[PDB]
Short mmCIF file of C-alpha atoms in Angstrom, two decimals:
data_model
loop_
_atom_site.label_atom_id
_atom_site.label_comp_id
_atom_site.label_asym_id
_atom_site.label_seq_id
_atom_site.Cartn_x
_atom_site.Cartn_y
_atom_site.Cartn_z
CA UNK A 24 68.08 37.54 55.92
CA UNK A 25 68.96 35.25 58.59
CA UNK A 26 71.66 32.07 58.29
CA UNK A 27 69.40 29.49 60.50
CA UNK A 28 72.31 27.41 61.61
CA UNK A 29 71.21 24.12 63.96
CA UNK A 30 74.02 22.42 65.45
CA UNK A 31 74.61 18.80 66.69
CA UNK A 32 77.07 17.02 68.60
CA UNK A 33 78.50 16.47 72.39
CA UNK A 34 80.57 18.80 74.57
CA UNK A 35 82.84 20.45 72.39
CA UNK A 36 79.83 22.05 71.03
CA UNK A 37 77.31 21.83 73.92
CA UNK A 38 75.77 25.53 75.20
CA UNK A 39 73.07 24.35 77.07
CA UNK A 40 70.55 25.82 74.79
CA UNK A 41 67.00 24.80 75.29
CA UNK A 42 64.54 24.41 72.71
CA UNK A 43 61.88 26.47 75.10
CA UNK A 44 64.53 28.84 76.12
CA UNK A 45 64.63 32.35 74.80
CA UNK A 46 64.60 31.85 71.37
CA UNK A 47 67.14 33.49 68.73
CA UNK A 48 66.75 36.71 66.66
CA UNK A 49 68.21 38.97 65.53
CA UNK A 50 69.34 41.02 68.76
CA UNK A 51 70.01 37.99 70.57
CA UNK A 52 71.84 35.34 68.03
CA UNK A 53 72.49 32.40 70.03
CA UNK A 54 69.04 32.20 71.80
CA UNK A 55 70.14 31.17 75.18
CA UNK A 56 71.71 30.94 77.00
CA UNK A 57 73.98 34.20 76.92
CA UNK A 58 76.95 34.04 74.97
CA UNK A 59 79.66 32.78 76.75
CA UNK A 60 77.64 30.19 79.01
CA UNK A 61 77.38 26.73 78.75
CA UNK A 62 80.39 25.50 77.50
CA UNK A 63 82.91 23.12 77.88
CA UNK A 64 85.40 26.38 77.72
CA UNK A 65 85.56 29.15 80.11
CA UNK A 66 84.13 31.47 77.78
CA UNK A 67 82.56 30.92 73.87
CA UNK A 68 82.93 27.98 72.14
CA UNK A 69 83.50 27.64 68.14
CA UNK A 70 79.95 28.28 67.80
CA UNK A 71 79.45 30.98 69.85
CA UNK A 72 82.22 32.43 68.16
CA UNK A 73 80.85 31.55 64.59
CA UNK A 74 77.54 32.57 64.99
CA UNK A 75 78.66 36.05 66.60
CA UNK A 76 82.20 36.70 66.27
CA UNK A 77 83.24 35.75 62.42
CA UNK A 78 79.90 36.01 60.86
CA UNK A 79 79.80 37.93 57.62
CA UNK A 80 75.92 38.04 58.13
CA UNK A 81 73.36 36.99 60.71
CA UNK A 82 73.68 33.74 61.89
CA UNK A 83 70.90 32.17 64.30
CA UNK A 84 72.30 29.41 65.90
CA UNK A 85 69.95 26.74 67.11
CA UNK A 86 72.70 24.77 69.43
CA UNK A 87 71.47 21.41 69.68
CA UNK A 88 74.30 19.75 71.33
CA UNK A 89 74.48 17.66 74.44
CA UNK A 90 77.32 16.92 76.74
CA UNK A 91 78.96 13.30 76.34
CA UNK A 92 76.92 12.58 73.30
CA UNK A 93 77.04 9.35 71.18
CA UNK A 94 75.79 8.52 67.48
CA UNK A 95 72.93 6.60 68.97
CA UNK A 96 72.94 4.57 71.72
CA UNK A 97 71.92 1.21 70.05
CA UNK A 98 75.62 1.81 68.71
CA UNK A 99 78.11 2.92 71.09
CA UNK A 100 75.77 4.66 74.36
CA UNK A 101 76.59 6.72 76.62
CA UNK A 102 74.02 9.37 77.80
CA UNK A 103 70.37 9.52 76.51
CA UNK A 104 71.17 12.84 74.50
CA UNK A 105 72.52 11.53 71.89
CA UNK A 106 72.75 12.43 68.32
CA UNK A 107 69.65 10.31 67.62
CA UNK A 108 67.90 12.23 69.89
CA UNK A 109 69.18 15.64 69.20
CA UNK A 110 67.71 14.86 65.30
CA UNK A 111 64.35 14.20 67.33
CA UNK A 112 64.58 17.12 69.00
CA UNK A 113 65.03 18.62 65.44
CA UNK A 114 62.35 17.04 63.99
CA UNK A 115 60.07 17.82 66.66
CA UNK A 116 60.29 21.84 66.83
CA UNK A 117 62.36 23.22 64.58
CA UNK A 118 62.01 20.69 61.19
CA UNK A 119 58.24 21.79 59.77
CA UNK A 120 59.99 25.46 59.58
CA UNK A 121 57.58 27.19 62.58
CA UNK A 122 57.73 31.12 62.02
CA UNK A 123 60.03 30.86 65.33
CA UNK A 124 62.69 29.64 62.53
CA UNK A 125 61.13 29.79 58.89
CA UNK A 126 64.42 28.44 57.45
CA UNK A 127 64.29 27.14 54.04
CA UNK A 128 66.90 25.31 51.93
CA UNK A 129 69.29 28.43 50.81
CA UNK A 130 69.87 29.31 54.22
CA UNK A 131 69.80 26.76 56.83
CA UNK A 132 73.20 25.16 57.92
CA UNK A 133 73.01 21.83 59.74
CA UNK A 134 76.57 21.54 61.68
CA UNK A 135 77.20 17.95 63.07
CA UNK A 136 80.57 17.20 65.16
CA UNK A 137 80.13 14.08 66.34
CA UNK A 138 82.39 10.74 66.89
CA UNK A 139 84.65 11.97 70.14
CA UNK A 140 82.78 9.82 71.92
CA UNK A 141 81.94 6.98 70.26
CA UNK A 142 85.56 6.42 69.50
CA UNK A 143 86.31 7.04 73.17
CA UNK A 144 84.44 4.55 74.40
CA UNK A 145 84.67 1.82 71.62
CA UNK A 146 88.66 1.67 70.76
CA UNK A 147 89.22 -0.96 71.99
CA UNK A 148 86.77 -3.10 72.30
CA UNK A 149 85.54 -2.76 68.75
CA UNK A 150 86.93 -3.39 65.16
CA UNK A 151 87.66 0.26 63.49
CA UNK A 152 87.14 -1.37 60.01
CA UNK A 153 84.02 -2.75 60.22
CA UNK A 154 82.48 -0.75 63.08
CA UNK A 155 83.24 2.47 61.96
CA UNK A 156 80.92 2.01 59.27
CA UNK A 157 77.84 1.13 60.58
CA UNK A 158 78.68 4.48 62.82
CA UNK A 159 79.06 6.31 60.07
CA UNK A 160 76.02 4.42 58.49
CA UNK A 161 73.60 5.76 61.35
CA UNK A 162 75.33 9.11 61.09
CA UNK A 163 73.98 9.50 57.36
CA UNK A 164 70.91 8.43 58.11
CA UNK A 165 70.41 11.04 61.05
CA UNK A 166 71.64 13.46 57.90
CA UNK A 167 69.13 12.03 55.76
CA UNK A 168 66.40 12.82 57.79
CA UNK A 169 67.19 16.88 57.41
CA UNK A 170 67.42 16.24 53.98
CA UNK A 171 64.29 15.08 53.66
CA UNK A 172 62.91 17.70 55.69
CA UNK A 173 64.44 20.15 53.20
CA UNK A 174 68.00 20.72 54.67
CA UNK A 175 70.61 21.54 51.62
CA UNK A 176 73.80 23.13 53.20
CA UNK A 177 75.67 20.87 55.82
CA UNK A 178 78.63 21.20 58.08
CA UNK A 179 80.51 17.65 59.30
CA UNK A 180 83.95 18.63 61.85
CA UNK A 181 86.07 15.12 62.18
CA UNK A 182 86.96 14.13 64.82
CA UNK A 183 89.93 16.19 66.48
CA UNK A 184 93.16 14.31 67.76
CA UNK A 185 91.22 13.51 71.44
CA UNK A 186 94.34 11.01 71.55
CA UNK A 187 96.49 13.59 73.15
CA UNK A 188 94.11 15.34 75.55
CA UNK A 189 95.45 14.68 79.30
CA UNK A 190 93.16 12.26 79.58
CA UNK A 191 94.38 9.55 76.89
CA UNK A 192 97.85 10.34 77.72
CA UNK A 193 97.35 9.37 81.25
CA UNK A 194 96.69 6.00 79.76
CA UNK A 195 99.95 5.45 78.51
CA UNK A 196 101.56 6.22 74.73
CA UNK A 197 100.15 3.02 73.66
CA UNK A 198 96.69 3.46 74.57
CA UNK A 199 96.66 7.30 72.84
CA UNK A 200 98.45 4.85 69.75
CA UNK A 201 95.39 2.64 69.71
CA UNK A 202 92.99 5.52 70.23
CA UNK A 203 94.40 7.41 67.51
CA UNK A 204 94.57 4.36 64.92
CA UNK A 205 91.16 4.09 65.15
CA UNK A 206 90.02 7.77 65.23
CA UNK A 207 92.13 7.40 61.78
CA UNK A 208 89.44 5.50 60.42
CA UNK A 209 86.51 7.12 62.09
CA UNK A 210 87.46 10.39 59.95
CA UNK A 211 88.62 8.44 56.64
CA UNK A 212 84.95 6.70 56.61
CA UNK A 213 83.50 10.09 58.10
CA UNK A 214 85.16 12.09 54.54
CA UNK A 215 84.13 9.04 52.61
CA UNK A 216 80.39 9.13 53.72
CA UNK A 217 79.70 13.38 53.39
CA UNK A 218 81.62 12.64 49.91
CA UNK A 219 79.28 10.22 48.75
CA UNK A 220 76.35 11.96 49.97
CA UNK A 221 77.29 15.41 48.40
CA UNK A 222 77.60 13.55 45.09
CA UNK A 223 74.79 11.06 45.58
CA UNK A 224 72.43 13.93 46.28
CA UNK A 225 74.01 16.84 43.70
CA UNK A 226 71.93 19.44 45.32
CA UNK A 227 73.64 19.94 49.08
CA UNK A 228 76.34 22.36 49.77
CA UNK A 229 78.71 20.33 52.19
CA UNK A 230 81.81 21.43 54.20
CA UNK A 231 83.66 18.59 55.69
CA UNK A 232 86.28 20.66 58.49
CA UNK A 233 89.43 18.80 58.93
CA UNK A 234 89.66 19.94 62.67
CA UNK A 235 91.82 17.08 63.20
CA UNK A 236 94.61 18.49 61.35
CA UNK A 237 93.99 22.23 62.38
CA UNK A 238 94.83 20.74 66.56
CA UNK A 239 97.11 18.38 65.38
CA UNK A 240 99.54 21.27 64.56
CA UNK A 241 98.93 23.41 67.82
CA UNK A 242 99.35 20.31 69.25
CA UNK A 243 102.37 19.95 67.33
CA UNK A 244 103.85 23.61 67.89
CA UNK A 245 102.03 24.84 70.94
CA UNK A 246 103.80 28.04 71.19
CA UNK A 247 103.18 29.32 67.59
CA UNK A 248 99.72 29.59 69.08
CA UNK A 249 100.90 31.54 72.05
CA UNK A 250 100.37 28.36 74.09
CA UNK A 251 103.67 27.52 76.94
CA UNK A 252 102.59 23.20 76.07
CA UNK A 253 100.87 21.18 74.57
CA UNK A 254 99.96 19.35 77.86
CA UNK A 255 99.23 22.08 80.32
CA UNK A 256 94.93 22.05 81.46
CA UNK A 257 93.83 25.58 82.54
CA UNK A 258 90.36 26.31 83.31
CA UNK A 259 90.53 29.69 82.59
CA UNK A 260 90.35 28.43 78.69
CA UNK A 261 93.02 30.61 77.38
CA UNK A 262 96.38 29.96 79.25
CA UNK A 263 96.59 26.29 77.89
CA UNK A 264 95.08 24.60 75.27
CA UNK A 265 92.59 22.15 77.19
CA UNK A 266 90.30 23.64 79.63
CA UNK A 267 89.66 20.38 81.47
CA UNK A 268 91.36 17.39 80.80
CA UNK A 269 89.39 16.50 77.28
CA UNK A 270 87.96 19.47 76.52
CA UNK A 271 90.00 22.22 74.97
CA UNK A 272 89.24 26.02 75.64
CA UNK A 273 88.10 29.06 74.48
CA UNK A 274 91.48 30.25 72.97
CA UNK A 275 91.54 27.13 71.06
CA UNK A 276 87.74 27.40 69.91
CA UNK A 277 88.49 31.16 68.51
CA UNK A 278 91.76 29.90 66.54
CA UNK A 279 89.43 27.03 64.90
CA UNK A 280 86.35 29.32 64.41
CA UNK A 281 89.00 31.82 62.85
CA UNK A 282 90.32 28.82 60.69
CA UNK A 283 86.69 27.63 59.63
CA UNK A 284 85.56 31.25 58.66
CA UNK A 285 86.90 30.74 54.91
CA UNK A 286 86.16 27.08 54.49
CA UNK A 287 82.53 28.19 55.68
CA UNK A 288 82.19 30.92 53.02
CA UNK A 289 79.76 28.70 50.35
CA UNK A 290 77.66 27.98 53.29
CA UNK A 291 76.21 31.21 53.69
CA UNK A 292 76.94 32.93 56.75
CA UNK A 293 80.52 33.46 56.70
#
C-alpha cells in the first residue's frame, strides 16, 4: 500500500523526472530518473532521500519539480515551468487517478517548496507586505486545485535562509539584509495561508516544514554538522554545505530529510 507522493517546486527539489519516463513502482520508487540523478546536489536530494532512504513504507514519488521555478509567471516569472504549470502537468496525467497512480485521499502526499525564487527575483523591487500575499494567494489556489481533485494530506517547506548562499553574500551584507527581511514575510504569510487552509477545510492533514530554521542553525554552527564553514561551495555535495553557489548539497539534503522524517509521520509514509 503505496504513499503516492507528487512533489512541486524549483531546483532544490528538481530530479528531472518526466511524466512519460519510466514510471514508479514498487521496485523502482522514484520513477526516473535513477536515484541520485538530476539534482541540484551531487548525489540525492531531500526527496530522493525521503522517498527511499527514511521511508517507513513505500513511497512513490512523482517529482514534479522544475529548475528556477516561480509561483506563476503572471506574478514574479522566470522560466515557463513554473508552479502553475507543474499543477497542469498534475492535472493533466496524474489528477483523474490513472491505474499508473490510483492514489486516493488517505495516501497521496502533495509536497510544494516553492518561494526561493520568487523572493529572489522580487526583493527589491516589490513590497513584501502587500506582494507576498497575492503570492501566497496564487499558491493556495494552485493547492486548491488538488483539493478539489481529491488531495487531503499536504506538505508546504518555507523558504530556507537563500540570504546567505554565496550568491547573496556576494551582493554585500545589506543586500542578504534586504533579501532576508522579505523572505521573513514570504514564510510568516506562507504559515499563515497552510494554517488557514488546514482549518478552513477540517479534513487535510498538513505539515508546514520550517526548513528555514533547520539551515539557519547549520548555517549558524557549521561544524556541529561536520561542515569546515558556512561559506565554503563544493560540488562534490558533501564537503561544504552548498553544492553550487545557491544550491546546497547532498549532505545537507540527508540532514533535512533526517530532520523531516518525524514531522512527516501523520502524513503517511514516514
Amino acid at each position: 500500500n503505496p504513499t503516492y507522493f507528487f512533489t512541486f517546486g524549483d531546483s532544490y527539489s528538481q530530479t528531472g523526472f518526466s511524466a512519460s519516463g519510466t514510471q514508479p513502482s514498487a521496485s523502482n520508487p522514484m520513477g526516473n530518473p535513477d536515484l541520485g540523478i538530476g539534482t541540484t546536489t551531487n548525489g540525492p536530494n531531500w526527496i530522493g532521500y525521503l522517498t527511499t532512504t527514511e521511508n517507513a513504507s513505500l513511497v512513490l514519488s512523482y517529482n514534479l519539480a522544475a529548475g528556477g521555478a516561480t509561483i506563476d509567471n503572471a506574478l514574479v516569472p522566470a522560466y515557463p515551468g513554473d508552479l502553475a504549470s507543474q499543477f497542469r502537468l498534475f492535472e493533466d496525467v496524474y489528477a483523474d487517478k490513472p491505474a499508473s497512480a490510483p492514489w486516493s485521499a488517505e495516501d497521496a502526499v502533495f509536497g510544494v517548496w516553492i518561494g526561493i525564487n520568487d523572493i529572489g527575483n522580487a526583493y527589491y523591487s516589490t513590497d513584501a507586505e502587500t506582494y507576498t500575499p497575492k503570492l501566497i494567494s496564487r499558491l493556495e489556489s494552485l493547492v486548491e486545485e488538488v483539493y478539489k481533485n481529491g488531495g487531503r494530506k499536504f506538505l508546504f517547506l518555507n523558504v530556507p535562509p537563500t540570504s546567505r548562499s554565496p550568491l547573496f553574500l556576494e551582493q554585500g551584507e545589506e543586500v542578504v539584509k534586504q533579501h532576508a527581511e522579505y523572505l521573513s514575510v514570504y514564510n510568516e504569510n506562507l504559515e499563515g495561508m497552510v494554517d488557514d487552509f488546514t482549518k478552513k477545510k477540517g479534513d487535510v492533514t498538513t505539515v508546514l516544514y520550517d526548513s528555514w530554521s533547520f539551515m539557519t542553525k547549520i548555517l549558524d554552527d557549521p561544524t556541529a554538522y561536520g561542515f569546515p564553514d558556512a561559506t565554503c561551495i563544493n560540488d562534490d555535495g558533501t564537503s561544504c554545505i552548498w553544492w553550487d553557489n545557491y544550491h546546497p548539497g547532498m549532505k545537507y539534503h540527508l540532514l533535512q530529510a533526517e530532520d523531516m522524517k518525524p514531522k512527516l509521520r501523520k502524513l503517511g509514509g514516514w
